[PDB]
Design a protein around this ligand. Structure first.
Ligand SMILES: *[C@H](Cc1ccccn1)C(=O)N1CCN(c2nc(OC[C@@H]3CCCN3C)nc3c2CCN(c2cccc4cccc(Cl)c24)C3)C[C@@H]1CC#N
Ligand SMILES: Nc1nc2c(ncn2[C@@H]2O[C@H](COP(=O)(O)OP(=O)(O)NP(=O)(O)O)[C@@H](O)[C@H]2O)c(=O)[nH]1
Ligand SMILES: [Mg+2]
Length: 163
């Protein structure tokens, strides 16, 4: 089977852990990684997901863990404008460690189940279009779009590996 190293990044409290746990265990709730065997478009895939946590620091060991990622989920929360404005920073750090302008990534607007949204869908769609990447709205609470976010990311890695 093909293994894919995925990293989930984004601002404090956006739901990076809740998204990973919902994917792995189908439940709603320190840095660790989680493995899950899945079938995507008929191909059995082993997803190895790093749920980013800890302090902001740029040691060689921190860069080496992040560089291990083949694709990244850039997560913001639809009710947190600051988390959306922080997406640029996370994308910047991914391109730096991967040393490439072309890295598989998916923009994820999480907490779509909450009312009182502050980031409009159109604004996130236009940003993703500028980056040349997919945008998916998710809810780790109701599971809406969770599988679609990780599977779309695997499809982006496949597109990158084929080219
Ligand atoms: C929130 C922590 C929290 C919990 C409870 C109370 C208060 N805070 C959390 O999960 N964090 C924040 C710290 N950290 C990182 N934060 C940033 O940037 C935060 C912010 C935005 C821009 C300027 N800055 C003040 N950036 C990173 C991390 C973790 C390390 N990151 C990193 C390091 C080396 C290479 C990398 C390559 C690609 C991607 C990343 Cl994330 C890389 C950068 C951890 C989390 C947020 C996350 N993820
Ligand atoms: N309503 C709602 N709440 C969510 C959703 N995803 C996460 N949360 C809530 O948001 C908070 C943060 O979730 P968590 O998964 O810890 O986020 P994190 O990005 O991993 N945080 P940390 O930065 O500390 O590592 C929790 O109270 C969690 O229940 C979602 O889709 N909808
Ligand atoms: Mg977490």
């Amino acid at each position: 089977m093909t293994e894919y190293k995925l990293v989930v990044v984004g601002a404090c409290g956006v739901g990076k852990s809740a998204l990973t746990i919902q994917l792995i265990q189908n439940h709603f709730v320190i840095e660790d990684s989680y493995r899950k065997q899945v079938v995507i478009d008929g191909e059995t895939s082993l997803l190895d997901i790093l749920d980013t946590a800890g302090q902001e620091e740029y040691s060689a060991m921190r860069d080496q863990y992040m560089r291990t990622g083949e694709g990244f989920l850039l997560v913001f929360a639809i009710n947190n404008t600051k988390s959306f404005e922080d997406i640029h920073h996370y994308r910047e750090q991914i391109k730096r460690v991967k040393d490439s302008e072309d890295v598989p990534m998916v923009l994820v607007g999480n907490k779509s189940d909450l009312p009182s949204r502050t980031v409009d869908t159109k604004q996130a769609q236009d940003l993703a279009r500028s980056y040349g990447i997919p945008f998916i709205e998710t809810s780790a609470k109701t599971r809406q779009g969770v599988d679609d976010a990780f599977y779309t990311l695997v499809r982006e890695i496949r597109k990158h590996k084929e080219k």
